[PDB]
Amino acid sequence: LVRDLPQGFSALEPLVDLPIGINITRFQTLLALHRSYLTPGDSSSGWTA
Amino acid sequence: YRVVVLSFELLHAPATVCGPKKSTNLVKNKCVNFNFNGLTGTGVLTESN
């Protein structure tokens, strides 16, 4: 029942350390397309808007 | 003749492949020179809770 970031404290444990060794300046987020790009539905084809 | 070449990359970079060459059997309760994952020192070892 919290739309935005909740108020509290949760420490972030280490997950993985990766030796890629390149330069990174920009990044993007990848999503999952449940609907169809060919035929877009009027509504509810996606996930609750 | 089956041939395998192993090119080792030694750069100023992370080491992801290392040698388990010998895990010396534990000798505790005698103060010794120890080297644990690169940390070097002298002292005695004991079990801890």
- The neighbour count for residue B45, using CB atoms within 10 Å, is 14
The vertex-A13 CA angle with A9 and A16, nearest 5°, equals 150
CB within 8 Å: B13 and A19: yes
**Nearest residue on chain B to A22, alpha-carbon basis:** B13
Q: Can you read off the two tokens belonging to residue A24?
A: 């990174």
CA distance to partner chain A, nearest, from residue B9 (Å) = 13
Distance from C-alpha of B22 to C-alpha of B26, rounded to nearest angstrom: 12
State the structure-solving technique. cryo-EM
Closest to B35 in 3D by CA, of B47, B49, B22: B22
Distance from C-alpha of B28 to C-alpha of B44, rounded to nearest angstrom: 7
Burial string for B13-41 (b: 16+ CB within 10 Å, else e) reads eeeeeeeeeeeeeeeeeeeeeeeeeeeee
Closest to B6 in 3D by CA, of B20, B21, B17, B22: B17
Task: Give all strands (DSSP E) within chain B, no chain letters.
Answer: 32-36, 39-43
User: Which chain B positions have a beta carbon within 8 Å of A21's beta carbon?
Assistant: 13
User: Which chain B positions have a beta carbon within 8 Å of A17's beta carbon?
Assistant: 14
